[PDB]
């Protein structure tokens, strides 16, 4: 019985320019 | 019994320019 | 019994310009 | 019985320029 | 019974330029 | 008056998400 | 008056998330 | 008046997250 | 008046996070 | 008046985090 | 003999959000 | 014989959020 | 015979957040 | 015969947050 | 015959936070 | 081949500006 | 081949500006 | 091949500015 | 090959500025 | 090959500035 939790809650990102893999969940 | 949770809740993104894989879930 | 959850709830994206894979679910 | 928690809650990011792997969860 | 907790709560990032692996959880 | 209630009394093996926008300017 | 209540009394094996925006300018 | 209450009385084996934005300018 | 209460009376084997933004300028 | 209360009376084997921003300029 | 020149030539504006008096000429 | 020159040529603005009097000419 | 030159040429602005009087000419 | 030169040429500004009178010409 | 030169050429500004009168010409 | 020429041989008391975009992605 | 020429042989009492973008990604 | 030439042979009492962007990523 | 030439042979009583960006990542 | 030449043979009573960025990461 294996449970994996990847959560993003209430996060604020003002500006994202020329970026990669920002605020993401990767399994 | 395996459960995988990838969640995005209440996240704010002001501006995204020329970016890749922003605020995404990848399995 | 395997359950996979990829969820996007209540997320705000102000502006997306020349970007790829923004706010998406990929399995 | 193994549980893995990767959580991001209430984090503020003012500006992200030419960056990689910012505020992300990687399993 | 093994539990692993990687948490980010209430963290503020003013500006991130040309950086890698900032404010992220890696398992 | 605004009342926002989320109640859970059973056994939950899935995801339960609630998003509400009242009198706001959101985009 | 604003009342935001989240109540949990059962057994939870999943994720329960609540996001609320009241009288705010969000983007 | 603003009242924000999170109550947990059962047995929790998962994640319970609550995010609230009241009268704020967020982006 | 602002009242922010987090109450836990059961047995918790997971993560319980609460984030609140009241009358603030956040980005 | 501002009242911020965190109460724990049960047995906790996990993480309980609370983040609050009242009348502040945060980024 | 009075000559006033207010000129805007070849300027690029990627994204403008919730702003005032951007790239304008005022006499 | 009075000549006043206010010129903006070839300027790039990536992202402008919640700003005032950006890249403008005022006489 | 009075000549006043206020010039902006080839200037790059990556990100401007919550700012005033950026890259402007005021007479 | 009076000549006043205020020039901005080839200047790079990575990120400007909560600032005033940045890279501007004032007469 | 009076000539006044205020010049800014090829200057790089990485990050400017909560600052005043940065990289500006004042006459 | 690309040839961009600006030639001035007379007496100029005004502003002469030239902007060119060749094979570029501009926004 | 790219040739960018600016030639001035007369008497100039004004401003002459030239901006060129060739094969570039600009925003 | 790239050739950028600025030639001035007359009498200049004003401002002559030249800005060029070739094969670059600028923002 | 890249050739950047600035030539001045007359009498200059003003400002002559040249800015060039070749094959660079600038912001 | 890169050749950057600045030549002055006349009488200069003003300012002559040259800025060049070749194959660089600048911000």
Author numbering:
A (entry chain I), B (entry chain E), C (entry chain A), D (entry chain M), E (entry chain Q), F (entry chain C), ...: 11 to 37
Describing publication, verbatim:
Human islet amyloid polypeptide (IAPP) is a 37-residue polypeptide hormone that is co-secreted with insulin from pancreatic β cells and plays an essential role in glycemic regulation. IAPP forms amyloid deposits in the pancreas of >90% of individuals with T2D.43–45 A single genetic mutation resulting in a serine to glycine substitution at residue 20 (IAPP-S20G) is associated with familial, early-onset T2D.46,47 Recently, cryo-EM structures of IAPP amyloid fibrils assembled in vitro for the wild-type (WT)48–50 sequence and IAPP-S20G48 have been determined, as well as those of patient-seeded WT IAPP. Here, we used cryo-EM to determine structures of amyloid fibrils at different times during in vitro fibrillation of a disease-related variant of human islet amyloid polypeptide (IAPP-S20G). Strikingly, the fibrils formed in the lag, growth, and plateau phases have different structures, with new forms appearing and others disappearing as fibrillation proceeds.
The fibrils present after 6 weeks, which represents the growth phase of fibril formation, are strikingly different to those observed at the 3-week time point. More surprisingly, and in marked contrast to the single structure solvable to high resolution at 3 weeks, six distinct fibril polymorphs could be identified at this time point. However, four fibril structures could be solved to high resolution (3.1–3.4 Å). Larger fibril assemblies accumulate as assembly progresses, both in terms of the average repeating crossover length of fibrils and the average number of subunits per layer of the fibril, i.e., the number of proto-filaments in each fibril form. For example, 36% of the dataset shows 4PF fibril structures in the 22-week plateau sample compared with 11% and 0% in the 6-week growth and 3-week lag phase samples, respectively. Importantly, however, because there is a shift toward fibrils with a higher mass per unit length as assembly progresses, the larger 4PF forms have a greater total calculated stability per layer of the fibril compared with the 3PF and 2PF forms. First, we provide a molecular mechanism by which larger fibril assemblies could be formed, by accretion of subunits that dock against the preformed surfaces of their predecessors.
